[PDB]
Amino acid sequence: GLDFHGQTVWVTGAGKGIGYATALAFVEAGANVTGFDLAFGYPFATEMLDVADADQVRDVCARLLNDIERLDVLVNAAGILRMGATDQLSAEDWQQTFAVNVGGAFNLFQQTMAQFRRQRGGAIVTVASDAAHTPRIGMSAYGASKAALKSLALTVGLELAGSGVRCNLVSPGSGIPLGKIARPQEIANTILFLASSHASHITLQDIVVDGGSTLGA
Amino acid sequence: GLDFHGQTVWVTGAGKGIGYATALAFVEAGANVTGFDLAFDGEGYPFATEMLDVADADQVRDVCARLLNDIERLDVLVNAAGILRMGATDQLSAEDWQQTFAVNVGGAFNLFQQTMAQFRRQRGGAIVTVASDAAHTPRIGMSAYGASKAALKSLALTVGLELAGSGVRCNLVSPGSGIPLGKIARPQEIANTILFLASSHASHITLQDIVVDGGSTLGA
Numbered sequence: 001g002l003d004f005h006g007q008t009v010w011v012t013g014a015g016k017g018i019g020y021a022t023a024l025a026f027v028e029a030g031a032n033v034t035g036f037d038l039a040f041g042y043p044f045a046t047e048m049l050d051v052a053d054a055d056q057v058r059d060v061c062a063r064l065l066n067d068i069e070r071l072d073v074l075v076n077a078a079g080i081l082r083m084g085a086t087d088q089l090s091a092e093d094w095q096q097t098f099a100v101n102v103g104g105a106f107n108l109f110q111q112t113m114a115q116f117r118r119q120r121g122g123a124i125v126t127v128a129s130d131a132a133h134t135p136r137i138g139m140s141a142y143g144a145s146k147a148a149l150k151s152l153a154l155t156v157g158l159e160l161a162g163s164g165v166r167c168n169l170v171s172p173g174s175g176i177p178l179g180k181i182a183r184p185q186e187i188a189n190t191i192l193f194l195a196s197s198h199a200s201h202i203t204l205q206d207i208v209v210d211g212g213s214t215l216g217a
Numbered sequence: 218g219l220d221f222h223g224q225t226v227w228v229t230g231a232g233k234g235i236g237y238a239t240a241l242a243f244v245e246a247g248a249n250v251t252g253f254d255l256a257f258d259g260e261g262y263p264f265a266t267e268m269l270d271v272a273d274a275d276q277v278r279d280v281c282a283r284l285l286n287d288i289e290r291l292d293v294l295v296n297a298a299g300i301l302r303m304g305a306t307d308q309l310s311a312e313d314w315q316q317t318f319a320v321n322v323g324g325a326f327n328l329f330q331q332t333m334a335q336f337r338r339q340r341g342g343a344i345v346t347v348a349s350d351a352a353h354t355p356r357i358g359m360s361a362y363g364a365s366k367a368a369l370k371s372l373a374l375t376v377g378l379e380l381a382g383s384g385v386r387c388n389l390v391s392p393g394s395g396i397p398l399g400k401i402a403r404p405q406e407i408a409n410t411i412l413f414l415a416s417s418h419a420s421h422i423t424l425q426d427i428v429v430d431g432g433s434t435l436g437a
């Protein structure tokens with residue numbers, strides 16, 4: 001099974017959706033979970049955090065890293081979706097899309113990489129999107145932000161490979177597709193797999209969970 | 218050969234590097250070229266220059282609206298603006314992160330916002346965007362640069378899809394940053410590939426990205 005007993009697990013975007021399902025799944029698997037979100041009863045510890053807010057990420061992460069022994073798993077599951085034709089998208093939606101969808105994980109990585117290096121090992125799973133894999137009308141900015149996020153996460157994975165850290169992604173969707181859209185609980189199970197000891201030879205990979213809509217791209 | 222006589226061509230990043238070499242190559246091929254850049258500190262520009270920050274949406278809107286009032290057709294847009302700021306991910310400064318994305322993705326975004334209506338109205342034309350092989354494979358020291366170039370590529374491909382019904386071709390070149398094969402590619406050599414993709418000889422090529430780095434990505 002998927003067992004994370006005793007492990008310290010951080011999940012961003014934990015107030016709803018994929019991040020919430022993932023946090024709950026880690027709690028069920030025996031982990032000590034902290035969930036982070038803009039705002040929020042929860043069966044895990046909660047921290048308010050705007051992942052785009054670099055000063056808040058620094059303050060919150062520094063405080064928490066003082067009291068833990070290892071950060072066993074980091075899940076980046078924060079994100080926002082702002083759709084529109086490329087030439088109709090507002091300036092605010094462009095800036096916010098990148099600040100959250102790329103800057104968020106950037107800020108987390110800036111504050112956690114030294115911990116991964118000093119402890120050795122651990123796993124990072126980042127939630128991208130199948131829009132990072134194929135052009136999607138109406139999602140040029142969203143897709144582009146998720147493509148940046150994927151690229152960033154893979155280079156961070158290369159930077160941390162010498163420390164033994166495994167770094168992977170899941171790309172949810174937004175007779176093909178096959179079956180109903182994949183729900184947060186299904187995404188959460190894939191995240192736990194990639195975070196687990198059963199995936200110890202898997203790094204720099206990205207599993208698309210969208211019923212095949214990208215035709216393998 | 219590559220003939221652009223009578224065509225109106227816009228090139229960003231035209232003050233130096235690849236954008237300059239591309240603007241010069243289009244001038245030599247007969248085009249009427251306008252170059253855009255933050256600075257034109259070189260000693261020679263045989264094309265019209267517009268000095269502005271392509272990352273600034275308001276400046277791009279004002280300049281491009283004015284220029285589009287005076288031209289009948291925008292035959293080619295080349296997005297060649299870009300800055301390279303290197304560092305370990307957890308050492309990169311906030312300024313370097315912000316400016317990397319503002320220039321390397323925001324610049325092309327602003328140009329697309331101001332030119333897509335023109336491309337639709339005229340029913341054709343070509344766009345070429347300069348990405349990087351760092352968008353294709355992770356490169357230590359280049360996490361932000363590569364990520365910005367991956368966003369740029371994604372954006373350009375979706376714009377290409379949005380404009381495909383108007384007959385617009387939209388492609389990319391990804392320069393570098395017994396493999397690699399040959400010496401480092403000079404700006405003039407990258408410019409040649411851009412001219413090819415902008416040309417009628419590429420009329421059925423769209424949504425493609427030619428990596429020009431001596432094979433360093435091994436086909437990725």
Ligand SMILES: O=C(O)c1cccc(O)c1O
Nearest residue numbers: 001002189192193196198
């Ligand atoms: O329980 C699981 O879901 C599971 C998934 C992947 C691999 C495993 O070993 C598992 O137990």
Ligand SMILES: O=C(O)c1cccc(O)c1O
Nearest residue numbers: 218219409412413416418
């Ligand atoms: O002259 C060229 O560079 C050229 C390049 C691509 C295709 C052509 O036909 C050319 O003439």
Ligand SMILES: O=C(O)c1cccc(O)c1O
Nearest residue numbers: 393397399401402430431
């Ligand atoms: O562009 C490059 O970086 C490059 C490097 C080595 C060999 C090449 O041909 C190149 O184009």
Ligand SMILES: [Cl-]
Nearest residue numbers: 016017018019
């Ligand atoms: Cl979600």
Ligand SMILES: [Cl-]
Nearest residue numbers: 089090091092
């Ligand atoms: Cl606006």
Ligand SMILES: [Cl-]
Nearest residue numbers: 260261262263
């Ligand atoms: Cl001059």
